[PDB]
Amino acid sequence: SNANITSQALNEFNMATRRLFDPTASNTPGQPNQQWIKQINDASPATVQKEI
Amino acid sequence: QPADPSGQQTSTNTSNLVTYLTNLGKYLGYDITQSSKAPNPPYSQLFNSNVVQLVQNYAYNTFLGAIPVDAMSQSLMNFVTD
Amino acid sequence: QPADPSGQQTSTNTSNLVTYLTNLGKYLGY
Numbered sequence: 200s201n202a203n204i205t206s207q208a209l210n211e212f213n214m215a216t217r218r219l220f221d222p223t224a225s226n227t228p229g230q231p232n233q234q235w236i237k238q239i240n241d242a243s244p245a246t247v248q249k250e251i
Numbered sequence: 252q253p254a255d256p257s258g259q260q261t262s263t264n265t266s267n268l269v270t271y272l273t274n275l276g277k278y279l280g281y282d283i284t285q286s287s288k289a290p291n292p293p294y295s296q297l298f299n300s301n302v303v304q305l306v307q308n309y310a311y312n313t314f315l316g317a318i319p320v321d322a323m324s325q326s327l328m329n330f331v332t333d
Numbered sequence: 334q335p336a337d338p339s340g341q342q343t344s345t346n347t348s349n350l351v352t353y354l355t356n357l358g359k360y361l362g363y
Contacts, residue, residue, distance in 0.1 A: 207317035210310045238298055243362025245295045258339030265346035272353050281360040286352060289359040
């Protein structure tokens with residue numbers, strides 16, 4: 200019902216490069232789930248500390 | 252009326268307090284004077300804990316499963332006994 | 334009786350303090 204296919208190498212890739220560029224992210228300002236850099240640009244100090 | 256010096260001194264102290272709070276806000280990197288530029292609503296939690304949690308769980312599962320194991324019996328491919 | 338300006342000044346200062354603390358809390362993310 201929610202079967203999702205992933206591999207070891209693919210998961211490592213999506214782990215390492217989900218914070219650099221995300222093809223599933225939104226590239227236009229004003230939408231949610233934007234790029235990680237842009238989200239950091241607006242995040243609070245506590246949020247970026249947790250992300251660290 | 253006879254002005255109390257305590258009132259004037261407290262007025263100067265409070266103005267100094269507001270100035271010093273503004274300066275501290277500026278030093279920390281924020282502009283405190285206007286509430287509009289402040290975040291609304293504020294956010295303290297992670298961006299999206301659900302998606303990252305899913306990624307970590309899937310990574311743990313993939314590491315556990317991908318590694319090739321001796322497959323001759325159900326009790327022979329175990330990683331940890333009890 | 335006429336009001337001493339010190340009281341009004343302190344009231345405005347304290348309201349500004351309330352506002353500034355709320356903005357600082359919002360900026361930190363709370």
